[PDB]
């Protein structure tokens, strides 16, 4: 798939707001993911023991992971589709080391959309959400193709 320049502008415009508080958005997104799909928490040997949302909010390790996730995703989005180089090491670690099924990438995509809709209603109307969804779908499709080449595809 290919996004138009107008769609990229909608995506990067809301992303600029997200970047005013990377740590806070990172926390919100991961907690939303863990609450909505607890099975994803099991993949994180580092956080598997957290029992409540309060414990999650207090974890400095989870906050650091959130910043790492958003910083990597932001670098990919800013490439506006020309992200092959950035995708390779990410696909390799998530397929071979962490063993993350594509299904879980869809779950985190849902969490990103939920949080942006909650925090940026004025900059995340229907058109902006459609553009962000298209960007995340492109990301998942390209990662899935890489998983297959790497021998995982799942
Ligand atoms: C927007 C999608 C995502 C991005 C950009 C992303 C990015 C990253 C980055 C950059 C790291 C650190 C270096 C590495 O190991 O590659 C990481 C680690 C990891 N990711 Fe992801 N990730 C994503 C989605 C997921 C999902 C959905 C899961 C699990 C349900 C996941 C599980 C992990 C695990 C287990 C680690 C290691 C965490 C640790 O250090 O203990 N990732 N991810």
UniProtKB/Swiss-Prot annotation:
From the Swiss-Prot or TrEMBL record, give the protein name.
Myoglobin
Domain Globin: start-end pairs: 2-148
| PTM annotation (Phosphothreonine): residues | 68
Q: Which family does it belong to?
A: Belongs to the globin family.
List residues binding heme b: 94
Its function, per the record, reads:
Monomeric heme protein which primary function is to store oxygen and facilitate its diffusion within muscle tissues. Reversibly binds oxygen through a pentacoordinated heme iron and enables its timely and efficient release as needed during periods of heightened demand. Depending on the oxidative conditions of tissues and cells, and in addition to its ability to bind oxygen, it also has a nitrite reductase activity whereby it regulates the production of bioactive nitric oxide.
Query: Where located?
Result: Cytoplasm, Sarcoplasm
Where along the chain is nitrite bound?
65
Which GO terms fall under molecular function for this chain's record? heme binding; metal ion binding; nitrite reductase activity; oxygen binding; oxygen carrier activity; peroxidase activity
What species is given as this protein's source?
A: Physeter macrocephalus
Q: Subunit details for this protein?
A: Monomeric.
């Amino acid at each position: 798939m290919v996004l138009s320049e107008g769609e990229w502008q909608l995506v990067l415009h809301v992303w600029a707001k997200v970047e005013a508080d990377v740590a806070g958005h990172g926390q919100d997104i991961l907690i939303r993911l863990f609450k909505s799909h607890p099975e994803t928490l099991e993949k994180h040997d580092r956080f598997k023991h957290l029992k409540t949302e309060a414990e999650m909010k207090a974890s400095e390790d989870l906050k650091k992971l959130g910043v790492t996730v958003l910083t990597a995703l932001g670098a990919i989005l800013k490439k506006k589709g020309h992200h092959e180089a950035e995708l390779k090491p990410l696909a390799q670690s998530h397929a071979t080391k962490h063993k993350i099924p594509i299904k879980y990438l869809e779950f985190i995509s849902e969490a990103i959309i939920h949080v942006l809709h909650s925090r940026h209603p004025g900059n995340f109307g229907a058109d902006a959400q459609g553009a962000m969804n298209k960007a995340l779908e492109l990301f998942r499709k390209d990662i899935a193709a890489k998983y297959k080449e790497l021998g995982y595809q799942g």
